[PDB]
Each structure stands twice: as structure tokens, then as C-alpha cells.
Scaffold this motif. Sequence first.
Motif, PDB file in Angstrom:
ATOM      1  N   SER A 185      35.324  33.317  16.731  1.00 37.90           N
ATOM      2  CA  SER A 185      36.056  34.237  17.608  1.00 37.90           C
ATOM      3  C   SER A 185      35.181  35.460  17.911  1.00 37.90           C
ATOM      4  CB  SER A 185      37.351  34.659  16.900  1.00 37.90           C
ATOM      5  OG  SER A 185      38.263  35.270  17.788  1.00 37.90           O
ATOM      6  N   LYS A 186      35.725  36.454  18.611  1.00 35.89           N
ATOM      7  CA  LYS A 186      35.043  37.726  18.882  1.00 35.89           C
ATOM      8  C   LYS A 186      35.450  38.784  17.855  1.00 35.89           C
ATOM      9  CE  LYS A 186      36.062  38.411  23.310  1.00 35.89           C
ATOM     10  NZ  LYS A 186      35.810  38.902  24.686  1.00 35.89           N
ATOM     11  N   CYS A 187      34.533  39.675  17.490  1.00 30.88           N
ATOM     12  CA  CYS A 187      34.871  40.909  16.786  1.00 30.88           C
ATOM     13  C   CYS A 187      33.964  42.049  17.257  1.00 30.88           C
ATOM     14  CB  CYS A 187      34.792  40.692  15.268  1.00 30.88           C
ATOM     15  SG  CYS A 187      35.183  42.259  14.431  1.00 30.88           S
ATOM     16  N   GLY A 188      34.564  43.075  17.862  1.00 25.08           N
ATOM     17  CA  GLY A 188      33.874  44.319  18.214  1.00 25.08           C
ATOM     18  C   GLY A 188      33.575  45.212  16.999  1.00 25.08           C
ATOM     19  N   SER A 189      34.510  45.316  16.044  1.00 27.27           N
ATOM     20  CA  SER A 189      34.366  46.123  14.811  1.00 27.27           C
ATOM     21  C   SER A 189      33.195  45.699  13.898  1.00 27.27           C
ATOM     22  CB  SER A 189      35.678  46.056  14.017  1.00 27.27           C
ATOM     23  OG  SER A 189      36.759  46.589  14.777  1.00 27.27           O
ATOM     24  N   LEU A 190      32.876  44.401  13.821  1.00 23.66           N
ATOM     25  CA  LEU A 190      31.805  43.826  12.983  1.00 23.66           C
ATOM     26  C   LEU A 190      30.392  44.280  13.399  1.00 23.66           C
ATOM     27  CD1 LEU A 190      30.601  41.645  10.994  1.00 23.66           C
ATOM     28  CD2 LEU A 190      31.153  39.945  12.751  1.00 23.66           C
ATOM     29  N   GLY A 191      30.219  44.675  14.659  1.00 25.56           N
ATOM     30  CA  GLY A 191      28.942  45.116  15.221  1.00 25.56           C
ATOM     31  C   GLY A 191      28.484  46.530  14.828  1.00 25.56           C
ATOM     32  N   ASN A 192      29.197  47.231  13.937  1.00 24.42           N
ATOM     33  CA  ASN A 192      28.911  48.616  13.537  1.00 24.42           C
ATOM     34  C   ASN A 192      28.989  48.826  12.007  1.00 24.42           C
ATOM     35  OD1 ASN A 192      30.226  51.606  13.118  1.00 24.42           O
ATOM     36  ND2 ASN A 192      28.746  51.668  14.725  1.00 24.42           N
ATOM     37  N   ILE A 193      28.143  49.718  11.476  1.00 24.94           N
ATOM     38  CA  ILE A 193      28.220  50.242  10.095  1.00 24.94           C
ATOM     39  C   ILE A 193      28.025  51.772  10.001  1.00 24.94           C
ATOM     40  CG2 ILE A 193      25.808  49.581   9.620  1.00 24.94           C
ATOM     41  CD1 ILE A 193      26.962  48.788   6.676  1.00 24.94           C
ATOM     42  N   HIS A 194      27.439  52.413  11.022  1.00 27.28           N
ATOM     43  CA  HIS A 194      27.062  53.836  11.023  1.00 27.28           C
ATOM     44  C   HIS A 194      27.635  54.620  12.212  1.00 27.28           C
ATOM     45  CE1 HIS A 194      23.384  52.847   8.234  1.00 27.28           C
ATOM     46  NE2 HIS A 194      24.505  53.115   7.545  1.00 27.28           N
ATOM     47  N   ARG A 225      45.535  24.172  16.522  1.00 27.00           N
ATOM     48  CA  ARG A 225      45.335  24.517  15.105  1.00 27.00           C
ATOM     49  C   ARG A 225      44.103  25.381  14.855  1.00 27.00           C
ATOM     50  NH1 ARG A 225      45.408  26.310  10.082  1.00 27.00           N
ATOM     51  NH2 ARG A 225      45.567  24.829   8.492  1.00 27.00           N
ATOM     52  N   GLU A 226      42.951  25.035  15.419  1.00 24.05           N
ATOM     53  CA  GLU A 226      41.724  25.820  15.241  1.00 24.05           C
ATOM     54  C   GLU A 226      41.861  27.233  15.822  1.00 24.05           C
ATOM     55  OE1 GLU A 226      38.395  23.338  16.560  1.00 24.05           O
ATOM     56  OE2 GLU A 226      38.743  21.990  14.874  1.00 24.05           O
ATOM     57  N   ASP A 227      42.566  27.393  16.937  1.00 28.22           N
ATOM     58  CA  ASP A 227      42.893  28.702  17.494  1.00 28.22           C
ATOM     59  C   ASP A 227      43.792  29.512  16.554  1.00 28.22           C
ATOM     60  OD1 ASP A 227      44.698  30.027  20.333  1.00 28.22           O
ATOM     61  OD2 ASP A 227      42.806  30.668  19.436  1.00 28.22           O
ATOM     62  N   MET A 228      44.713  28.831  15.874  1.00 31.97           N
ATOM     63  CA  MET A 228      45.552  29.397  14.846  1.00 31.97           C
ATOM     64  C   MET A 228      44.796  29.804  13.593  1.00 31.97           C
ATOM     65  SD  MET A 228      48.618  30.574  14.883  1.00 31.97           S
ATOM     66  CE  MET A 228      49.563  31.207  16.293  1.00 31.97           C
ATOM     67  N   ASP A 239      41.262  36.514  12.727  1.00 29.42           N
ATOM     68  CA  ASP A 239      41.319  37.666  13.630  1.00 29.42           C
ATOM     69  C   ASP A 239      42.341  38.706  13.146  1.00 29.42           C
ATOM     70  OD1 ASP A 239      39.365  36.518  15.349  1.00 29.42           O
ATOM     71  OD2 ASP A 239      40.840  35.694  16.737  1.00 29.42           O
ATOM     72  N   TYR A 240      43.503  38.282  12.627  1.00 24.79           N
ATOM     73  CA  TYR A 240      44.415  39.195  11.976  1.00 24.79           C
ATOM     74  C   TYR A 240      43.827  39.797  10.703  1.00 24.79           C
ATOM     75  CZ  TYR A 240      48.673  40.145  14.418  1.00 24.79           C
ATOM     76  OH  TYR A 240      49.550  40.654  15.324  1.00 24.79           O
ATOM     77  N   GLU A 241      43.132  39.053   9.847  1.00 26.53           N
ATOM     78  CA  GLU A 241      42.502  39.550   8.633  1.00 26.53           C
ATOM     79  C   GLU A 241      41.329  40.474   8.908  1.00 26.53           C
ATOM     80  OE1 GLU A 241      42.890  38.305   4.460  1.00 26.53           O
ATOM     81  OE2 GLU A 241      43.131  40.066   5.575  1.00 26.53           O
ATOM     82  N   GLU A 242      40.563  40.269   9.978  1.00 30.35           N
ATOM     83  CA  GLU A 242      39.527  41.198  10.440  1.00 30.35           C
ATOM     84  C   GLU A 242      40.052  42.613  10.749  1.00 30.35           C
ATOM     85  OE1 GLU A 242      36.062  39.891  10.878  1.00 30.35           O
ATOM     86  OE2 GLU A 242      36.075  42.019  10.371  1.00 30.35           O
ATOM     87  N   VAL A 243      41.164  42.736  11.484  1.00 29.14           N
ATOM     88  CA  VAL A 243      41.641  44.057  11.937  1.00 29.14           C
ATOM     89  C   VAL A 243      42.346  44.881  10.854  1.00 29.14           C
ATOM     90  CG1 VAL A 243      41.669  43.437  14.377  1.00 29.14           C
ATOM     91  CG2 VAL A 243      43.781  43.171  13.018  1.00 29.14           C
ATOM     92  N   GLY A 244      43.040  44.289   9.872  1.00 28.44           N
ATOM     93  CA  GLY A 244      43.811  45.097   8.954  1.00 28.44           C
ATOM     94  C   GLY A 244      43.048  45.899   7.906  1.00 28.44           C
TER      95      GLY A 244
END
Lengths: 49, 150
Positions: free
Chosen positions: A22-31, B121-124, B130-135
Motif C-alpha cells: 500500500s502507500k504510506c506518506g508518514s513512513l518517508g520521514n524521521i526528522h 481479501r488482500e485489500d482488507m 494501513d489502519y495499524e500504520e496511522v494509529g
Amino acid sequence: HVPGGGSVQIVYKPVDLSKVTSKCGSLGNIHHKPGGGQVEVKSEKLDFK
Amino acid sequence: MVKCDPRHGKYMACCLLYRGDVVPKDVNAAIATIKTKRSIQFVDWCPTGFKVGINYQPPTVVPGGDLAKVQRAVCMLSNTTAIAEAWARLDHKFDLMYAKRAFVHWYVGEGMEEGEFSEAREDMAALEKDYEEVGVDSVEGEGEEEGEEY
């Protein structure tokens, strides 16, 4: 004859989360960025030459 | 009104739709207690956290109805990592039932391909991640602070 059936196979399959991506914008930064310029450059000491 | 405990996650945001006989300074104080009241925790990257609206009109009465008359009311709407409990539940239930392919054939007779179900399923799987990344709170001390777990 030998009765009692031949054989039948079960429907069962192993499971995995497929190393999904998937995409993550937050992962691209540490500083954080450095601060702005807090220093005066206009000031003058008013010497009569 | 969704049966996951909200204290499992932290709030990404809250919207509060207040109605009827509401004085804004009473909303101010309340949200100032709640924004320091320690049972309500917010994500590290939403220090604002809130959206209000204040409507002059209360709810109304209903004949043979089930809810009663109030001078003021509030809907809240809220987004929080707490709802991942459901993603984990589909992740549980599919890994029980689809692992043995039970009921698949009714779908396959009706214009699905087994390849879409696999994708969805893979999107899920990606979505609970993606939910675990943001919290999670923000990268801090990494490389510099002493260990905490032994």
C-alpha cells in the motif's frame, strides 16, 4: 467385489496475507526541519563619520 | 453505537453535532475537560482533534415513538484505530470459512471470479495494516534513546 466405496478428497487450502503493499506518506520521514532566521540585519550603530 | 471498545484505539478525529438549547461556552469547557480527561486519548498527529456544529433545533416527538423529549441533544461521529477490531474479525472469519471454500460456488454461479474474492481479501489485509500504520505515535528517539523492554 470389494464394497465400502473408493476414496473422496476434502476441500481445504492453506492461508496467507500475500506480502501486500500500500502507500504510506508518514513512513518517508524521521526528522524535522531547522528553524527560520531569528537575527536582525537592519540595525545600525549611528556613527557620525 | 458500534460494539468495539473505543479505548483500544486512539482517536484520529471526533465530530460532535450538538442540537437545540446549547450555549457555546458550555461546549468549550466540556471539550476542554475531554481534551485533558485521560480516558479519551488522541493520535500524536491530531492535536486539534475536533469538529463541532451547533443547531438551533432539537429533535422532535413521534407518535407511538421510542425516544422521548429533550431540550438538547448530540450526535457524535468518530474515527479511531479501534474499528480495526472488525478487520481482524473478517481476517478471522474468512480464514475459518474460505480456507475450506464453503459457499464459494453460489458466488461463482453468479458472475464473480474467484480471483476477485482473493483480491478483496488482500485489500482488507492491506487495510488493517494501513489502519495499524496511522494509529501509532510518531518516530522518536530512534537510534538515541536507551532500551525499554528486556
